[PDB]
């Protein structure tokens, strides 16, 4: 259901209450789907040492089948949507309307690369709580999908050309947000947990960790066919639902294959006080809220009588 409303509303995707709703919902859908053979969560009650809670449970081999989810207005509220084709959360929305439920969102947990998500109508869009704060994540929304085939064999495939065109767009937008005479450099993750340093996701019920270095090693404004990225299926990972660790059973199928559409990117920028004329960007992610946030940036719940 849709109903256009002639009035100016105020949005803020960095304080959107619906993000937390999804976040907790997804964390739940997961817990009942991908069950570990053992999970380790911290627990230092300050009673001296740090006790660790451990759970050993069944480990049925199953794959997480993302089923579209629609979020409708909770009891006593209403959902408003910023029909504007290009709006960045924080700010006013002149073209707004009351909706019954959001569009089908395909929940996907992953890092540095948003897959199977909504695309940007007009041009590529970049969003952040504060671009000036290098410690804040930059959400990039593409206007054109970019296929990425991955296999349990140990690698992911991506068109060298298509991706080279997407970077140009991103950098073109970056220099647009920062500096024109500025240079846009794309480097690899600076470091940290595995799940964050690589493009991590779950395919065929297994956890992948693919080295994205090749995807982020380029400079802008200053044969060749497919790109092959090294992956690796792990059994022991770091939980994303909360600080914790988990171990799953080894693969049973010998032919795990997945195809997704790169739709968005989570970037982070390098600090430095008055260095020079150039900015370096790196793959980000970790906080799945930024993933939900990339889809929910246009909605908002509101109290209604």
């Amino acid at each position: 259901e849709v109903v256009l409303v002639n009035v100016t509303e105020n949005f803020n995707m960095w304080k959107n209450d619906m993000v937390e709703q999804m976040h907790e919902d997804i964390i739940s859908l997961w817990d009942q789907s991908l069950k570990p053979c053992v999970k380790l969560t911290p627990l230092c009650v300050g009673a001296g040492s740090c006790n660790t809670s451990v759970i050993t449970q069944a480990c049925p081999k199953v794959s997480f089948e993302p089923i579209p989810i629609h979020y409708c207005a909770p009891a006593g509220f209403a959902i408003l949507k910023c029909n504007n084709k290009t709006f960045n959360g924080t700010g006013p929305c002149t073209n707004v309307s009351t909706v019954q439920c959001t569009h089908g969102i395909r929940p996907v947990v992953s890092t540095q690369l948003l897959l199977n998500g909504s695309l940007a109508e007009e041009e590529v869009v970049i969003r952040s709580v504060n671009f000036t704060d290098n410690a804040k994540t930059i959400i990039v929304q593409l206007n054109t999908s970019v296929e990425i085939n991955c296999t349990g064999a140990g690698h992911c495939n991506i068109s060298r050309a298509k991706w080279n065109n997407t970077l140009k767009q991103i950098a073109s937008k970056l220099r647009e947000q920062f500096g024109n005479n500025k240079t846009i450099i794309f480097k690899q993750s600076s470091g940290g947990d595995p799940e964050i340093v690589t493009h991590s996701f779950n395919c065929g019920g297994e956890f992948f960790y693919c080295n994205s270095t090749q995807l982020f090693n380029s400079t802008w404004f200053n044969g060749s066919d497919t790109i092959t990225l090294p992956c690796r299926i792990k059994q022991i990972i770091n939980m994303w639902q909360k600080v914790g660790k988990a171990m799953y059973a080894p693969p049973i199928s010998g032919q795990i294959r997945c195809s997704s559409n790169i739709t968005g990117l989570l970037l982070t920028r390098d600090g430095g006080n008055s260095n020079n004329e150039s900015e370096i960007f790196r793959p980000g992610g970790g906080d799945m809220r930024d993933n939900w946030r990339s889809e929910l940036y246009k909605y908002k719940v509101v109290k209604i009588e």
Partner: antibody
């Protein structure tokens, strides 16, 4: 391949506690999982329990779960077996054994159950 | 409650001949079955795991097959050094509650 050196024989009275050790050397201690297996004179092998050295988590046999504890000190590459409330029927040789699981330190864990590396074994006599 | 059982309590075979050891389970174990050899006063020796893969340093005369709740340990030409006790072991369940068979004694027949 790792080598499994067990601690010397034990002679304890019923009701006492025992703590046998096993020093592994030869490879990456955290890339292996260890298991303890006892054997009473004239009898077969009895699985006691196994620890996933990397996670530091152990699982024990039912009839033993509760008065048995297995641990490992990644610092000294040693595994320990602890048996409380000793019983005469506990008299037996205690074997320490391990197996490669993959690059556990890198998140690869096959969770292998079989046992490839064994130790000389430790005799533990429980009597009055 | 998974219990393994080795049929031949004692197998008397002539030197040079072949020997076959059976190990059934009270429940399906798939292929998580392993075989062990044990000389007196020594630690057990791993011969086969995954029901059929031979462990390093294990001669080809040694071989294992089967799945489910029935397995076999075949030794082609029994050599003097193959004189020992053999145990099977299933490690399929989880939580880990692995168990051993009561063993089979392969003795020299004369």
């Amino acid at each position: 391949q790792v080598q499994l050196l067990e601690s010397g024989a034990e002679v304890k009275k019923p009701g006492s506690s025992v703590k046998v050790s096993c020093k592994a050397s030869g490879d990456t201690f955290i890339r292996y999982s260890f298991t303890w297996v006892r054997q009473a004179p004239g009898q077969g092998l009895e699985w006691m329990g196994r620890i996933i050295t990397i996670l530091d988590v152990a699982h024990y046999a039912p009839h033993l779960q509760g008065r048995v504890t297995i641990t490992a000190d990644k610092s000294t590459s040693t595994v320990y077996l602890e048996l409380r409330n000793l019983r005469s029927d506990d008299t037996a040789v205690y074997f320490c054994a391990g197996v490669y699981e993959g690059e556990a330190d890198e998140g690869e864990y096959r969770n292998n159950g079989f046992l490839k590396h064994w130790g000389q074994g430790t005799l533990v006599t429980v009597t009055s | 409650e998974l219990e393994l059982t080795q049929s031949p309590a004692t197998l008397s075979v002539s030197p040079g001949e072949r020997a076959t050891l059976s190990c059934r389970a009270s429940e399906s174990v798939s292929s998580d079955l392993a075989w062990y050899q044990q000389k007196p006063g020594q630690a057990p020796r791993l011969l086969i795991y995954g029901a059929s893969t031979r462990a390093t340093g294990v001669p080809a005369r040694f071989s294992g097959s089967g799945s489910g709740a029935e397995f076999t340990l075949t030794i082609s030409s029994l050599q003097s050094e193959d004189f020992a006790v053999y145990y099977c072991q299933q490690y399929n369940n989880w939580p880990p509650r692995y168990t051993f068979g009561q063993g089979t004694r392969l003795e020299i027949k004369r």
